[PDB]
Write a protein that binds this ligand. Structure first.
Ligand SMILES: [Cl-]
Ligand SMILES: [Cl-]
Lengths: 139, 139
């Protein structure tokens, strides 16, 4: 199993809980849509003038957990890493002309978890994988 | 609407994502079972020698989000506050002889979000409430 596949699974989860820090280091956590997820990282959006946006802009550190009980599997992904805002200039090199992903080009602001380490767990099958972003190991 | 009711809803969500801090202030987030939730706070368990446990013991600051798509409602609760370990001595004053909650008395360690502020949102009905723990307002 490889990262392309883990990230495809994550992308299909559609939604994750993202934990970020304010200027006092206090934790905050909310659901956000996973716009895309692949070998390059995890992409999501938020709006300027939201606290999620402020927090990410003030401190790149992020943790995310996502879970799917879609189909007959129960799948959990946990990631800890760093997020940055990204513009179309960068997105084009990742998504290019692919029609499934044209919506990502700009209102909203896209961010990317560009570096980190993660854990993928299929609970019903007892399969655990650890991986990095920005290198997958079956435990 | 009052806190007893919000917390009953939360308790029925069964599971939340809890975000905590390590000694470097880095965020971490995982699912944990909501053992109980009421006017006194939100109770959950973890084991010694887990990172969740270490983190909570090192820094009380916690954020939690929980979501239910049980029934026809879509319900989101977000809480930011502080958690502490609690022993049976304390739990008895909260749960007493109530048979539904005897399992809470001790292996595991119970914690309590004893203070904080929260947001309850029924997305399909457009109803938003803010509240505190340790005082509910319809927005
Ligand atoms: Cl949320
Ligand atoms: Cl988890």
């Amino acid at each position: 199993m490889e990262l392309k596949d883990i990230m495809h699974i994550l992308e299909d989860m559609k939604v994750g809980v993202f934990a970020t820090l304010d200027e006092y280091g206090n934790p905050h956590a909310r659901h956000a849509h996973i716009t895309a997820a692949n070998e390059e990282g995890i992409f999501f959006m938020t709006s300027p003038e939201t606290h999620f946006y402020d927090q990410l802009m003030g401190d790149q550190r992020v943790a995310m957990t996502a879970i799917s009980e879609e189909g007959y599997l129960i799948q959990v992904v946990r990631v800890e890493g760093t997020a940055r805002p990204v513009e179309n200039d960068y997105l084009k090199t990742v998504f290019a002309d692919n029609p499934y992903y044209q919506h990502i080009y700009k209102t909203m602001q896209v961010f990317q978890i560009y570096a980190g380490h993660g854990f993928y767990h299929s609970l019903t099958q007892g399969h655990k994988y650890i991986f990095s972003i920005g290198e997958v190991r079956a435990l």
